Write a protein that binds this DNA or RNA. Structure first.
Ligand SMILES: [Mg+2]
Ligand SMILES: [Mg+2]
Ligand SMILES: [Mg+2]
Ligand SMILES: [Mg+2]
Ligand SMILES: [Mg+2]
Ligand SMILES: [Mg+2]
Ligand SMILES: [Mg+2]
Lengths: 252, 189, 124, 155
RNA sequence: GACUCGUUCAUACUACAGUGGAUACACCAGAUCCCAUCAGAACUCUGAAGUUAAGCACUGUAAGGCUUGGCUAGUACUGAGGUGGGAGACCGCUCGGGAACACCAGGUGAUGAGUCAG
RNA sequence: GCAGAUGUCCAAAGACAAGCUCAAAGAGAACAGAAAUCUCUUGUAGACUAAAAGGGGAAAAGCUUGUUUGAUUUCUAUUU
RNA sequence: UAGAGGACAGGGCCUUGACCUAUUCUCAAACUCCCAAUAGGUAAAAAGGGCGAAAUAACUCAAUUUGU
């Protein structure tokens, strides 16, 4: 038997568009969105972090019957403007992005003076919830870096500490946000297999970013962020069909 | 062995077929359904007589079988064995039951409508009278008012004769055995 | 260029009886052969196997080698020895099938096929 | 004999053909208030909060809203008397009814009309005039386009 | 030109083709570190040498499906009426309501918020 | 009336989350066959969901894994 | 219920099959893509509704006023 019969097609229920594409959970999403129906007018802001292959995307989203509404938005490729080029999928970079997004949101609100949050690295705060959406939450994830960054900015993002690297080890987390792990890796590469190292951190090399400097650069970036943010209709088709038949006839 | 058949004439009771909720029900007497040159082409036989019930009645399987037999034997006697094709176009699914409380199953019956046909013969346009005769003979073995009814169609195929001819002339109609399929200018190439 | 036809995954397979220490022995043997810890396959514990990628897998295949039929319609193949080797061939971008995120279907022209597999075999 | 809480529900609670799955995530954003009229349409994909067989399709005023609940005042005819039943449901089943909104629209339009009338002092008749009899007309038809009819012979 | 969150949840699907990649998506390169396994396949982390080959986008197909429309058909069925017909089975009429499959024809998306590149 | 079912079973078959996809069919791979396990392709559920039958269920409500005891105390509004 | 068209199992390229493909006959109280008629429910505004202000709160919100 052919499995994909006419009958099968007739039966077939198509998934939701996003689910089909493979981008949203829906099960997760509804839970994230719906808040208590006796709390009418309470928006519930979700902090969306996407870890795309060569960027991180941090949005504050609101949710409405017609479509979601993005209040604040930051992509990791803005960080060039703030004096951090290369390593944009880096945990540090993610953190920075998160922070930036938070800052942007605050600016949009007109409420930046009250919520400074954690100054440098170690009224009730504006609340939001992490939409990690589809990437599984393993310990040392990059979305959690972003979340942390956001927190360090203004936002109350309720979180447990189990998913920061080495967990609760704060030193490790600190290292990660500085970029220190990356630096260490670079150093190790330099020490053994130099050709490989050259191949690998090519962009970094071109920039002229040695190991030691990376942390400093990240710090500077953080400081900067803190400071300021065509079709054919029926007739044509028919004509085409006719032409093909004619050609077939000719061939015959 | 059996009841009168006036017992099970009318279609009281809802239909009640062989399934999970019946089980121990004996077989229909009728097994063959269609006979006489069943393997014939569509182009072979043009003449088609129907035997239409003008009655909302039931028709025992046994009766049906008898009718079929009558049709066949007569045909054999008159024209050749391979000059006709006798479809019985009605099947016995609704089972009857008997008490001797709820009844235990006992024989099957082939419930019919005012419009629908019982038997259809399909023969060469020469032997239509014979076919008609056969069908009328058969009729004496059903209950209720049937009417033998010569059709405008080509032979079970749903086209009129002229129409069929026309189609044949411009090659829009593939013949299987008995059934014919009409090309619609639709699928891929 | 991306339409090269790498070996995706080689799977060494030892079906044996019903877990009476012979299975353990088989597992040990497998381990010795290839640096992977083996995994057990259950009744519907009867059998061991190991999945291998990359250079190691290739090496295994090469040693293992020491037919037109033993290729599948889908363009994998296998052979036996005691072991069964099954090699599963793919092209780059096989990940699109199997990732978690926007998992999708590979186009027909990018699935490997029998003839292609045969060709590949002939080449290596 | 067998009057369980989900009897005669082989079809009431069966999800319709090519609409299985679950309730869409945007259905949880329907705003409800103490007074909104509300259909109760049992999505049997959620098994929590499933209101009884009978209230499927029946509208009611919301009298109570909760975390994920909605109490609905629904009428039930009970032999000799209709009575108010306080059907506590989840949000998945409760849909916002549309009857009230037809009225609302009309109200809005009527306000505008009233304002307009006042602007000029006129006796505008608001109330919906039902389909009365048609007025006199003179319908031009060519003799060409008047297809005469006879009954049909039998066939 | 692309992307993120969405909305409707097949006009959005599927199959087989064709066309496209400045930026983007993606595949792809690697395993020190967080992490994850039988397996760095997945997941994670760190990358940027390549490539549109796939994904994705776009278009095609007397495509299947889906969906509007006509047509089936005032056919089937039916609410009320009947000291109507019919031995009954059932069938007309009066006041009303009125399908379905198939078939034929068209269509194959639309869109809210935000960002990015030029 | 019809076809049945109940007087139970469950520290998981409860709770939560994570991951995963099931039946079947096909084409393959020593011993291995109509059946063992493995691999891939197709797979709207045709599996499974304690026990009738019916609904529901696919990044699950199924399967595997991790962690647990909300199978807790008190009280309402109620539905059948 | 029938053949038609196709590409695995047995005998001496043919026959018997099963299996696919497109058909075909007839069916269902405990089948359903679809789906009437009738029956049913809510609504059709002054104890109310609009659009506003200002109060009150220990609720709600990031927002002594974010809203309820
Ligand atoms: Mg007698
Ligand atoms: Mg009866
Ligand atoms: Mg291409
Ligand atoms: Mg089509
Ligand atoms: Mg889960
Ligand atoms: Mg029928
Ligand atoms: Mg029925």
């Amino acid at each position: 038997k052919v499995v994909k019969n006419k009958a099968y097609f007739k039966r077939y229920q198509v998934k939701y568009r996003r689910r089909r594409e493979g981008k949203t959970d829906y099960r997760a999403r509804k839970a994230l969105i719906l808040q208590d129906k006796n709390k009418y007018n309470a928006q519930k802001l979700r902090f969306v972090v996407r870890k795309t292959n060569s960027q991180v995307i941090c949005q504050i989203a609101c949710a409405h019957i017609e479509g979601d509404k993005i209040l604040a938005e930051a992509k990791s490729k803005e960080l060039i403007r703030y004096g951090i080029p290369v390593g944009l999928k880096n945990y540090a970079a993610a953190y920075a992005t998160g922070l930036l997004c938070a800052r942007r949101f605050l600016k949009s609100l007109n409420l930046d003076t009250q919520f400074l949050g954690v100054e440098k690295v170690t009224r009730k705060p504006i609340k939001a919830f992490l939409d990690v959406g589809i990437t599984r939450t393993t310990t040392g994830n990059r979305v959690f870096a972003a979340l942390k960054g956001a927190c360090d900015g203004g936002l109350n993002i309720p979180h447990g500490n189990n998913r920061f690297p080495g967990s609760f080890n704060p030193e490790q987390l600190r290292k990660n946000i500085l970029g220190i792990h990356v630096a260490e890796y670079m150093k190790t590469l330099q020490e053994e297999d130099n050709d490989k190292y050259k191949t690998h951190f090519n962009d970094y090399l071109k920039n002229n970013i040695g190991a030691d400097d990376i942390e400093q650069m990240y710090l500077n970036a953080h400081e900067k962020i803190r400071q300021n943010p065509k079709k054919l209709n029926a007739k044509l088709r028919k004509k085409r069909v006719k032409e093909k038949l004619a050609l077939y006839v000719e061939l015959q | 062995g059996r009841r009168p058949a006036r017992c099970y004439r009318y279609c009281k009771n809802k239909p009640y077929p062989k399934s999970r909720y019946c089980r121990g029900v004996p077989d229909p007497k009728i097994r063959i359904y269609d006979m006489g040159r069943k393997k014939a082409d569509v182009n072979e036989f043009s003449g088609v007589v129907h035997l239409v019930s003008y009655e909302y009645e039931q028709i025992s399987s046994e009766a049906l079988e008898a009718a079929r037999i009558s049709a066949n034997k007569y045909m054999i006697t008159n024209c050749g064995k391979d000059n006709f094709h006798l479809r019985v176009r009605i099947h016995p699914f609704h089972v009857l039951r008997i008490n001797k409380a709820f009844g235990k199953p006992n024989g099957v019956v082939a419930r019919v409508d005012i419009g629908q046909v019982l038997l259809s013969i399909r023969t060469k346009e020469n032997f239509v009278s014979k076919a008609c005769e056969a069908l009328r003979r058969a009729k004496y073995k059903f209950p209720g008012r049937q009417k033998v009814f010569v059709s405008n169609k080509w032979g079970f195929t749903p086209f009129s004769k002229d129409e069929y001819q026309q189609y044949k002339k411009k090659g829009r109609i593939i013949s299987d055995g008995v059934s014919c399929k009409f090309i619609r200018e639709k699928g891929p190439l | 260029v991306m339409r090269e036809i790498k070996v995706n995954k080689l799977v060494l397979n030892i079906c044996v009886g019903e877990s009476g220490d012979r299975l353990t022995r088989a597992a040990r043997v497998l381990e010795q052969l290839t640096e992977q810890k083996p995994i057990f396959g259950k009744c519907r514990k009867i059998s061991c196997f190991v999945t291998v990628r990359g250079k190691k897998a290739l090496e295994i295949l090469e040693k293992g080698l020491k037919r037109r039929k033993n290729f599948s319609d889908t363009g994998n193949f296998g052979f036996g020895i005691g072991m069964d080797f099954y090699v599963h061939l793919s092209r780059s971008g096989y990940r699109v099938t199997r990732r978690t995120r926007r998992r999708s279907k590979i186009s027909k022209t990018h699935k490997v096929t029998k003839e292609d597999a045969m060709k590949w075999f002939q080449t290596k | 004999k067998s009057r369980g809480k989900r009897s005669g529900t082989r079809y009431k609670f069966s999800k319709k053909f090519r609409k299985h799955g679950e309730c869409t995530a945007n259905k949880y954003l329907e705003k409800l208030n103490y007074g909104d009229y509300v259909d109760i349409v049992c999505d049997s994909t959620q098994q929590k909060g499933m209101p009884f067989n009978y209230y499927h399709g029946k509208t009611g005023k919301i009298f109570h809203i909760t975390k994920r609940g909605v109490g609905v005042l629904v009428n039930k005819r009970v032999k000799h008397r209709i009575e108010q039943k306080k059907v506590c449901v989840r949000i998945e089943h409760v849909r916002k009814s549309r009857c009230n909104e037809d009225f609302l629209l009309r109200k809005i339009k009527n306000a505008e009309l009233i304002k307009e009338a006042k602007l000029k002092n006129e006796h505008i008749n608001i109330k919906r005039k039902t389909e009365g009899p048609k007025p006199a007309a003179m319908i031009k038809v060519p003799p060409s386009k008047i297809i005469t009819i006879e009954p049909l012979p039998f066939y």
